[PDB]
Amino acid sequence: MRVIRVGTRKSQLARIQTDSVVATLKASYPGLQFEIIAMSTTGDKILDTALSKIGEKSLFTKELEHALEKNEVDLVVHSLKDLPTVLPPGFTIGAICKRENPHDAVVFHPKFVGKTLETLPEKSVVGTSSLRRAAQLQRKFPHLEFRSIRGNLNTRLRKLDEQQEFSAIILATAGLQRMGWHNRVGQILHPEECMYAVGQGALGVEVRAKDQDILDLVGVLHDPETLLRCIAERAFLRHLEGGCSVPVAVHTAMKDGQLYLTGGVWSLDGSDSIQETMQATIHVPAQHEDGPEDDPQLVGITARNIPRGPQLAAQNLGISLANLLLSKGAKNILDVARQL
Numbered sequence: 001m002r003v004i005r006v007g008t009r010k011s012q013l014a015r016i017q018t019d020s021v022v023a024t025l026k027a028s029y030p031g032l033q034f035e036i037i038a039m040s041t042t043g044d045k046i047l048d049t050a051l052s053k054i055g056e057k058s059l060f061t062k063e064l065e066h067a068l069e070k071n072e073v074d075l076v077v078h079s080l081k082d083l084p085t086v087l088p089p090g091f092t093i094g095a096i097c098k099r100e101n102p103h104d105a106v107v108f109h110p111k112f113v114g115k116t117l118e119t120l121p122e123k124s125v126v127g128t129s130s131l132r133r134a135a136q137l138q139r140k141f142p143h144l145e146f147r148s149i150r151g152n153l154n155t156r157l158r159k160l161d162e163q164q165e166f167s168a169i170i171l172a173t174a175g176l177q178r179m180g181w182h183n184r185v186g187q188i189l190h191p192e193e194c195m196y197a198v199g200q201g202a203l204g205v206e207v208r209a210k211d212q213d214i215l216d217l218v219g220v221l222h223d224p225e226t227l228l229r230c231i232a233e234r235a236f237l238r239h240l241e242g243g244c245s246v247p248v249a250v251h252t253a254m255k256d257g258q259l260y261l262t263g264g265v266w267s268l269d270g271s272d273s274i275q276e277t278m279q280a281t282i283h284v285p286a287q288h289e290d291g292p293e294d295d296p297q298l299v300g301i302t303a304r305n306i307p308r309g310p311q312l313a314a315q316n317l318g319i320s321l322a323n324l325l326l327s328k329g330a331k332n333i334l335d336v337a338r339q340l
């Protein structure tokens with residue numbers, strides 16, 4: 001029997017998400033043996049030099065995709081928001097795991113315990129390096145300043161606690177939840193304050209597009225409600241053709257046999273914004289189906305064990321909302337942001 005090799009990063013949140021995925025696979029396949037591979041480049045000193053230019057530092061995701069290509073590993077676990085809408089040739093998102101809290105949360109300086117962003121003092125600095133968050137939060141909170149914070153969860157948390165510069169930092173709720181920093185969440189931001197990124201709170205499993213054996217096994221992890229919402233969001237963002245890091249946010253819901261999708265676009269400052277909401281009658285399919293291998297992936301996702309009709313409706317909904325936003329001049333806001 002083939003040991004299933006899982007490619008991870010020696011990082012803390014990377015390994016936690018990987019372990020969680022593996023625990024689910026292990027419950028589905030009691031016997032199945034799993035090997036975990038982690039390459040840190042024999043130390044953080046070779047990774048520290050790569051920090052000479054951080055941010056959209058998805059060289060690690062390319063390394064993982066190079067290992068998959070070599071057949072060094074069999075599956076890799078990622079945050080669905082770190083996976084682009086167009087995956088390279090020979091790779092696909094084999095599973096869309098059940099969604100964790102998709103909302104953006106606020107952490108406050110130990111002085112501002114119990115105080116929401118609304119109740120913070122005026123001209124308080126708020127640390128975030130997300131143009132999506134800053135654009136929304138600047139528009140909503142004109143009296144708060146939004147400066148850039150740099151580093152990982154523990155670095156950003158440490159900086160806020162130690163230094164007097166920042167009064168609050170913006171971070172993902174699911175992120176804090178996984179690390180077991182749920183107690184530092186001060187405010188969970190709603191769509192009116194800050195809509196979330198595409199596929200935030202959901203884990204994606206990347207695998208080789210032509211590895212039926214690995215797609216079969218990992219198919220068990222697909223959650224249909226998350227998958228459908230995540231297709232809609234990915235389809236909307238892909239169709240917008242934003243480039244890469246732009247102020248694009250979404251909100252999705254599935255209640256009463258309807259998929260609601262809210263999509264928005266903002267200028268870096270937030271002054272100009274095109275937020276719109278559309279909905280489709282899409283029923284979350286409880287039953288798994290035996291679909292064919294010839295069906296192309298949708299927005300990088302292969303979910304042939306889940307009914308295809310409902311997936312196509314989700315893509316359509318996202319495309320419809322992208323199309324309306326473009327008509328309302330969403331193309332213009334994006335290019336201004338790309339140039340800063």
Ligand SMILES: *Cc1[nH]c(Cc2[nH]c(Cc3[nH]c(Cc4[nH]cc(CCC(=O)O)c4CC(=O)O)c(CCC(=O)O)c3CC(=O)O)c(CCC(=O)O)c2CC(=O)O)c(CCC(=O)O)c1CC(=O)O
Pocket residue numbers: 055056057058079080081082083084085086128129130131132133170171172174175197198199200201202237238243244245
């Ligand atoms: C061209 C193209 N590339 C990508 C990849 C890509 N995605 C983002 C989103 C992102 N990721 C992070 C860091 C982060 N990742 C996971 C978590 C925890 C929560 C979770 O698991 O969901 C975090 C931390 C956190 O969310 O708190 C951030 C940085 C947040 C911050 O600065 O405070 C973001 C931005 C955001 O959410 O607003 C990025 C941007 C990373 C950056 O630092 O600029 C990238 C890198 C890149 O541009 O290459 C995508 C997919 C985007 C998507 O679907 O959301 C695309 C777009 C496309 O191909 O259509």
